[PDB]
Design a protein around this nucleic acid. Structure first.
Lengths: 103, 18, 103, 236, 195, 179, 106, 54, 94, 45, 131, 181, 150
RNA sequence: UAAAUUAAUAAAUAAUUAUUAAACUAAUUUUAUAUUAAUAUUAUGAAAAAUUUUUUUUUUUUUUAAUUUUU
């Protein structure tokens, strides 16, 4: 979520409001974050992470009125496979060249 | 000079010779 | 320059027949007596040596540490809203209504 | 249009400038009795008044030794200018017993800020804003002497404020002045003309630090009821 | 970026200092860049620079009414050029120009209430022609040498260009040593002018 | 509008035969007179009554070979600070004092030197050590300055000079209240 | 232009009680920041300071017995600083060099 | 207790009427209605009305 | 939406281009929100430099209010204050 | 005379108000400010 | 008793030199820049020179000294037109400090220019040389 | 020269980009105590994030220089308005009171960023890094945070640009300020 | 000393003292516009302005109405008695920025609704201070119950 | 305190004064500055030539105050 707040002005202020909202009023900052990303129509399909986070902060703060969600469930629904393979296994690769420039 | 009609206010006399 | 007396009549003023007396009887005496006198800040390092003396008393913030011999300051012993009972006379005109300087 | 004020602007008039009277005790009430219930020859005063304002400016600058001297002189010329125990000669030492205490000499401080009170109760009707300025010095030099038993004089000082300070007359005239403005969107800063009681009623401002210097006592000694005995009073 | 064709600054044959008749000169080169003013190149007065032309050019000498007299492009020449042109470049301005004066004159004027100094005019020549000059090189006409200029309407006086001989400049201008500068003093109001 | 006809009707007593009788014609008159007193007071009364005085102090200067043209410039040269109405009071009631002035401005006596600016004492620069007991060097002199100027003014017998008879002891009136 | 030995006349005058500089330099700021040809008994001035007249207090009183020896890389840029002095009265200002000055290292 | 003289503001009774011409028109209910604008034809005369009803 | 064209007018007279919906009420809801100058047509934000229009009525009103002598001078032609007073008025009739 | 000629640093003379008037303890190197902030602040008599 | 301050710290330079010395009068010529008309201070330049302002009911010993005092020596309180004065004389300083306070910042960051004058002044007067 | 300091998470962490003498020094990350002082930590962090609309000033630390640098005692800063240090503002639109001095906000340990105030009660926008154990500033100045990283930088400034009076011999300022975590 | 005075230098710009010597009504508004920025409105006033560039422009256009002096930054510290070991930027950092007629804001309304929110920060500061004594009195009295439990 | 003006398919405001209300920021003295909206108000009258003196209509009372020389 940080690199989103760093990428575009659209996601920065919503994040900084959520980044340091009250433990009382969290899941609202994510709702008012989902509301702006939805209006300024985003790939609301492929952006389902803000829904899960909203379901993570509602599984607390009335745990009994809504279902229970874990942080892993949120990360399950994420645009991954950019980092896991093509990016993580690119970092160490450069580090190998750094060994064939030391040698 | 100050109501140009005419100036009849008493003027000062020049200074005597030293 | 720091070492020189530093009083410097401009060329135009020197050129014009605007020359006046000295030792008194010149409105500029109190000044040009104070400017011709030997200059104390004879060096940019002798400069600080005088300036490491005077304090900034009323400045907003953490007050200075006392000299270990004078009692605790007036300000913390008498609060900020209060001010000493100034004598109100024609020649001692103390600042009135001091609780408006806030902004 | 505006005003530059680049010339000398004579003052305006306003009802905040009325000469508010002083505050005293009732007729027969004497100070030591109230407490335990709970022409002239020429003297250059106009010159020594300038000589003590440089004490009020000095003792407020951290130069508490130099202030002691300037106060020394003005406290000498006053015990000659005014008769014995005059309401004024008693008040100057209250600037001296402070200037003493801020120079280690607490032994003379209490010897000074206690001398004033016998000039006050022995008077006819003492300046009430002074007996709360003395009973404050008497309460501060006891702190500098580090005696907690000598700290329950603040609460006894304000016992005189709550009793003998009619807290109306400070803001009697200034109360309706907001009804003077007649414009709503230009020069409307007159509908909110607010004068502050700390800046207008000194005895109230004094009585506040008492009830704040008394709290820090009971806060320091880890006293519970003492703090609340003050905070509720400081609010009331 | 020296503008593409908004400037060209191409070496010169003759006759800068545009006028009605402007070719008053004897054998040199100086011009204004021919950006669209390439109209020069049509029939002389400017020639495109080339590896040959940067050695010399056939400047128009007026003696034979053709660009006859050759001329070298060494240091002294270019040194001599501006020194020569800049002289009459001052002459071309103050001769063809007409400097107006917003001045003050009270009552039905006919005359200025603060007559013109010489430093006064030597401010205008710089103000309006950008021509810097020594004020003492201004000699009022022999009518008003004792009372400034002092008059409304159309006055004139004599600015003295000394440097006529060291540049060998005669018979091209009608006065080798001094040039008549023409003035025209208005009566501007208090809002009009100072002094 | 409001003619101020209430006030301006009592005045109709001190007018001549017509304005005194008929209320209308009296108002147009008394409001024409009162509107020209206030018109002459704020506009023209000064420039006239201010020159009958510059003629009386002047005429009283010709009796001493001088005149207002010279007196005015030399009452200021000497810093004398006399209103031009005061010089007429002297020239008419205290003729000697006026003459005494007229001798001063004619004398070759040096006028008082222009008031001095604020001089920084040397002790302001004099580096203070880390000493808490003794006072700052500049106050021990400035205070002395204030008590000398305190005793020079008037002849106050300060309890027939019961306060410290000398200055170095008057600056020690803070030790009088120590035990 | 000015023989390097004229500067060497400053090898025995700056040593006196008056340690004042005997040479200025109207040099570009990096040009004086890129070269150590400014240290001993020489003060930096921008030519728009002498001409405009900002450097009048720091200039000798005796305007006849006074030398400057301004230093600059360009020639035109140098004489356009000396001529600022003649505007103020001084004479023994010559626009010495840029290299001959780089050699009086003692 | 005052007269809203247009283009001049509230004025006292008994005050000055020299500058209350168009005010003596508004009180009489007389409406010129900016009819000196003969030159510029308003949308009124050039607005095709749909719907013979409205 | 960056324009880079001769952009257009708004959607006054509309030729509707449908994709898929109920959509049986478009041109009856595209001429219903078009007369109140509105969204419900998405408004097509164009002309990113509309500052030069806020800086015209900044000049076309600071050069036509100075056509009547902008006058930070005073209450014009004072000449009778500067002694001291409280200026009264002068009704316009002009 | 029509136009007087005086050093106009005289029209606002600083004799009765040096910085020691608005900074009381300055020659005592303390630099404390006690100005009168506005004519409107005037308490009273 | 009477008073004569004439300054904030008094400290008046005494005028009388010594039982035999010279008097040292102040130059009576008004500082005219061109020197040919050869003027003389005019009764309102002397008043400016002598520490007053234009009129002597201003910026001098005529205001800053109280009008009266009580016989016992008690001063007299301030007034509306007294505080409004003290604030004005403090304005005539804050006008000068804040002025010199901004020049300092401009000359400490090297923002004050080097070519003396405006762009429109040098393009007006020829005597300001070329840069 | 190590700064001991209390470590905790779930707190506003703010970073400053200091620059003295126009020399890029580095980043200074502050840990604000939202556990004991909720208000003062929100006024502070807000001025560092620059998200608040302009009120009495432009509520933002970027650009404002430190102005009271006493070597070895206190390095002051803040000063949204009147960049010399004579005006104290706040994002709530008024100088607001101090919350608590009980725990983690009474002791001014060397690892601390106090919240300077004009009056003892009405805090504002000026802060200060307590460089020494200020035994007197207890419960007078509400401590609000503590530096996490960059303690060498505030140790550089207090030396590079310092004077027993306080005025900086060189202009050390905040070239940028933002929230970190 | 026949040499350039050498050593570590300083630079001391000037400070003007301008005063009207002619009625500014007589001229256009373009000029009296430049005379407000000098804080001058009437014949006989005076002010002290810096000599920074944007002030020479305003003076270049009113040179026929004002008379100018030039005070240096050592004459200033001498005209008023100021020790040489003080600067001016630090001595000015003491007076608040809300001096008499604090600053110039565009309208006269924006001058009013600025003086208003300055009469409000006084009200508030008096109320917030009374709010603490209701927040302090609470927390302790909020503990007396808990402190009773242990 | 004189300013406004286009008859008629998709182009930001008529202007004045008036009543009533509204908001300070990339945009410097630590200067200065009457901007916005709603409503009320559209008749104060030039024809040719030439051309690309001045600030005053309006003062609370006492003082104070710098623009004078003849043919």
């Amino acid at each position: 979520l940080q690199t989103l707040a760093e990428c575009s002005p659209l996601h920065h202020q919503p994040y900084l409001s959520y980044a340091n909202a009250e433990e009382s009023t969290v899941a609202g900052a994510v709702a008012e974050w989902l509301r702006v990303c939805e209006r300024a129509k985003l790939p609301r399909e492929t952006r389902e992470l803000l829904r899960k986070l909203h379901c993570y902060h509602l599984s607390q703060c009335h745990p009994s009125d809504a279902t229970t969600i874990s942080m892993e469930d949120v990360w399950k629904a994420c645009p991954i496979m950019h980092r896991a393979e093509q990016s993580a296994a690119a970092f160490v690769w450069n580090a190998m060249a750094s060994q064939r420039l030391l040698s | 000079v100050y109501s140009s009609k005419k100036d009849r206010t008493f003027k000062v006399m020049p200074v005597p010779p030293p | 320059t720091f070492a020189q007396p530093a009083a410097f009549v401009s060329p135009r003023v020197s050129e014009s027949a605007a020359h006046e007396p000295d030792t008194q009887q010149s409105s500029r005496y109190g000044v040009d007596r104070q400017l011709r006198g030997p200059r104390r800040a004879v060096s940019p390092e002798r400069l600080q040596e005088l300036r490491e003396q005077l304090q900034f008393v009323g400045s907003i913030g953490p007050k200075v540490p006392p000299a270990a011999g004078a009692g605790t300051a007036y300000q913390d012993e008498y609060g900020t809203r209060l001010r000493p009972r100034y004598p109100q006379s024609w020649d001692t005109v103390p600042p009135h209504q001091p609780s408006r300087s806030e902004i | 249009i505006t005003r530059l004020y680049t010339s000398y602007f004579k003052g305006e008039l306003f009802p905040n400038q009325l000469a508010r009277p002083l505050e005293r005790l009732p007729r027969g009430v004497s100070l030591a009795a109230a407490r335990k219930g709970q022409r002239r020859p020429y003297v250059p005063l106009g010159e020594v008044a300038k000589l003590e304002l440089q004490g009020d400016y000095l003792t407020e600058g951290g130069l508490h030794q130099e202030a002691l001297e300037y106060y020394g002189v003005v406290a000498k010329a006053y015990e000659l200018a005014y008769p014995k125990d005059h309401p004024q000669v008693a008040g100057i030492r209250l600037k001296l017993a402070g200037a003493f205490r801020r120079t280690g000499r607490l032994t003379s401080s209490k010897a000074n800020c206690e001398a004033v009170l016998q000039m006050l109760d022995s008077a006819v009707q003492p300046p009430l804003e002074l007996i709360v300025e003395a009973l404050f010095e008497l309460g501060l030099t006891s702190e500098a002497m580090s005696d907690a038993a000598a700290g329950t004089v603040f609460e006894e000082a304000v016992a005189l404020v709550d009793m003998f300070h009619n807290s109306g007359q400070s803001h009697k005239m200034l109360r309706l002045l907001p009804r003077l403005g007649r414009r709503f969107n230009l020069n409307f800063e007159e509908k909110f003309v607010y004068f502050s009681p700390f800046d207008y009623d000194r005895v109230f401002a004094l009585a506040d630090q008492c009830l704040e210097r008394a709290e820090v006592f009971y806060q320091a000694r880890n006293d519970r009821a003492g703090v609340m005995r003050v905070l509720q009073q400081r609010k009331e | 970026m020296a503008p593409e064709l908004q400037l060209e600054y191409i070496p010169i044959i003759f006759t800068r200092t545009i006028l009605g008749p402007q070719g008053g000169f004897a054998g040199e080169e100086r011009l204004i860049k021919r950006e669209v003013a390439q109209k020069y190149m049509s029939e002389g007065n400017a020639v495109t620079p080339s590896a040959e032309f940067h050695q010399g050019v056939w400047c128009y000498n007026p003696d034979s009414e053709q660009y006859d007299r050759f001329v070298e492009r060494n240091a002294e020449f270019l040194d001599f050029a501006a020194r020569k042109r800049q002289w009459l470049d001052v002459y071309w301005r103050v001769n063809t120009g007409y400097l107006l004066f917003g001045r003050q004159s009270w009552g039905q004027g006919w005359l200025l209430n603060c007559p013109l100094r010489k430093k006064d005019i030597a401010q205008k020549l710089w103000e309006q022609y950008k021509v810097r000059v020594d004020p003492r090189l201004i000699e009022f006409r022999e009518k008003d040498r004792r009372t400034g200029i002092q008059d409304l309407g159309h006055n004139w006086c004599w600015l003295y260009l000394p440097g006529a001989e060291e540049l060998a400049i005669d018979r091209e201008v009608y006065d080798n040593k001094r040039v008549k500068v023409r003035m025209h003093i208005r009566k501007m109001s208090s809002y009009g002018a100072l002094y | 509008y409001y003619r101020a006809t209430a006030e301006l009707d009592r005045l109709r007593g001190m007018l001549r035969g017509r304005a005194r009788l008929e209320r209308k014609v009296g108002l147009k008159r008394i409001t024409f007179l009162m509107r020209t007193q206030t018109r002459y007071r704020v506009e023209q009364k000064a420039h006239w009554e201010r020159a009958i005085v510059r003629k009386n102090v002047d005429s009283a200067a010709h009796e001493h070979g001088s005149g207002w043209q010279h007196l005015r410039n030399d009452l200021a040269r000497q810093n004398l600070m006399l209103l031009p109405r005061t010089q007429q009071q002297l020239a008419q009631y205290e003729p000697l004092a006026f003459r005494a002035v007229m001798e001063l401005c004619a004398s070759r006596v040096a006028p008082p030197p222009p008031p001095m600016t604020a001089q920084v004492p040397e002790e302001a620069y004099a580096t203070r050590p880390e000493d808490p007991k003794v006072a700052h060097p500049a106050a021990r002199r400035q205070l002395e300055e204030c008590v000398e100027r305190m005793l020079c003014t008037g002849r106050s017998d300060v309890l027939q000079r019961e306060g410290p008879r000398t200055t170095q002891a008057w600056m020690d009136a803070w030790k009088e209240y120590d035990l | 232009t000015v023989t390097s030995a004229d500067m060497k006349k400053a090898l025995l005058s700056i040593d006196s009680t008056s340690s004042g500089a005997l040479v200025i330099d109207v040099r570009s700021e990096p040009e004086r920041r890129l070269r150590p040809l400014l240290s001993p008994a020489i003060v930096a001035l921008h030519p728009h300071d002498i001409l405009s007249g900002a450097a009048c207090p720091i200039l000798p009183s005796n305007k006849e017995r006074a030398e400057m020896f301004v230093v600059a890389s360009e020639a035109q840029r140098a004489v356009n600083a000396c001529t600022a002095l003649r505007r103020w009265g001084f004479s023994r200002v010559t626009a010495v060099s840029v290299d001959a000055v780089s050699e009086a290292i003692a | 207790s005052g007269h809203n003289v247009i283009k001049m503001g509230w004025m006292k009774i008994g005050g000055s009427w020299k500058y209350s011409r168009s005010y003596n028109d508004a009180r009489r209910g007389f409406a010129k209605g900016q009819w000196q604008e003969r030159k510029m034809t308003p949308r009124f005369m050039l607005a095709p009305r749909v719907s013979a009803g409205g | 939406a960056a324009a880079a064209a001769a952009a257009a007018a708004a959607a006054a007279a509309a030729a509707a281009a449908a994709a898929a919906a109920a959509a049986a009420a478009a041109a009856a809801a595209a001429a219903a929100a078009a007369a109140a100058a509105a969204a419900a047509a998405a408004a097509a934000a164009a002309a990113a430099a509309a500052a030069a229009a806020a800086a015209a009525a900044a000049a076309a009103a600071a050069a036509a209010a100075a056509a009547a002598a902008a006058a930070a001078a005073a209450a014009a032609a004072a000449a009778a204050a500067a002694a001291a007073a409280a200026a009264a008025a002068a009704a316009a009739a002009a | 005379r029509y136009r007087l000629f005086h050093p106009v640093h005289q029209t606002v003379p600083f004799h009765f108000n040096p910085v020691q008037s608005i900074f009381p303890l300055i020659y005592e190197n303390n630099l404390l400010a006690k100005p009168r902030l506005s004519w409107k602040d005037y308490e009273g008599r | 008793y009477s008073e004569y301050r004439s300054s904030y710290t008094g400290a008046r330079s005494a005028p009388w030199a010594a039982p035999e010395a010279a008097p040292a009068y102040p130059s009576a010529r008004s500082p005219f820049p061109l020197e040919r008309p050869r003027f003389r201070k005019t009764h309102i330049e002397w008043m400016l020179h002598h520490g007053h302002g234009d009129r002597y009911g201003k910026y001098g010993p005529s205001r800053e000294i109280a009008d009266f005092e009580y016989a016992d020596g008690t001063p007299s309180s301030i007034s509306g037109k007294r505080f409004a004065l003290k604030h004005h004389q403090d304005h005539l300083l804050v006008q000068l400090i804040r002025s010199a306070a901004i020049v300092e910042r401009f000359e400490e960051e090297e923002l004050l220019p080097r070519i003396p004058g405006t762009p429109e002044q040098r393009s007006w007067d020829p005597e300001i040389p070329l840069f | 020269l190590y700064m001991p300091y209390t470590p905790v998470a779930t707190n506003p962490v703010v970073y400053f980009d200091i620059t003295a003498e126009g020399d890029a020094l580095g980043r200074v990350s502050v840990e604000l105590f939202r556990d004991v002082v909720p208000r003062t930590s929100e006024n502070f962090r807000s001025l560092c994030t620059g998200e608040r609309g302009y009120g009495q000033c432009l509520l933002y630390y970027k650009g404002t220089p430190f102005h009271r640098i006493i070597p070895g005692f206190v390095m002051q800063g803040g000063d949204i308005l009147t960049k010399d240090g004579r005006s104290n503002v706040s994002v709530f639109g008024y100088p607001f009171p101090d919350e608590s001095f009980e725990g983690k906000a009474g002791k001014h340990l060397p690892g601390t960023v106090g919240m300077a105030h004009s009056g003892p009660n009405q805090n504002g926008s000026q802060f200060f890094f307590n460089l020494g154990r200020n035994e007197q500033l207890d419960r007078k100045f509400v401590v609000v945070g503590q530096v996490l990283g960059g303690w060498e930088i505030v140790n550089q400034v207090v030396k590079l640009c310092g004077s027993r009076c306080g005025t900086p011999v060189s202009r050390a300022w905040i070239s940028d300020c933002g929230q970190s975590g | 000393t026949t040499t350039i005075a050498a050593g570590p230098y300083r630079r001391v710009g000037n400070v003007f003292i301008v005063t009207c010597i002619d009625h500014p009504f007589k001229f256009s508004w373009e000029v009296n516009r430049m005379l407000r920025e000098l804080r001058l409105e009437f014949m006989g006033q005076t002010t002290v302005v810096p000599d920074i560039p944007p002030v020479r422009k305003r003076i270049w256009r009113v040179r026929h109405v004002v008379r100018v002096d030039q005070l240096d930054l050592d004459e200033a510290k001498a005209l008023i008695g100021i020790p040489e070991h003080i600067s001016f930027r630090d001595l000015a950092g003491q007076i608040p920025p809300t001096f008499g007629r604090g600053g110039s804001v565009a309208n006269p309304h924006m001058r009013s609704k600025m003086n208003f929110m300055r009469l409000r920060r006084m009200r508030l500061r008096d109320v917030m201070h009374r709010d603490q004594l209701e927040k302090r009195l609470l927390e302790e009295r909020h503990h007396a119950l808990q402190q009773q439990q242990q």
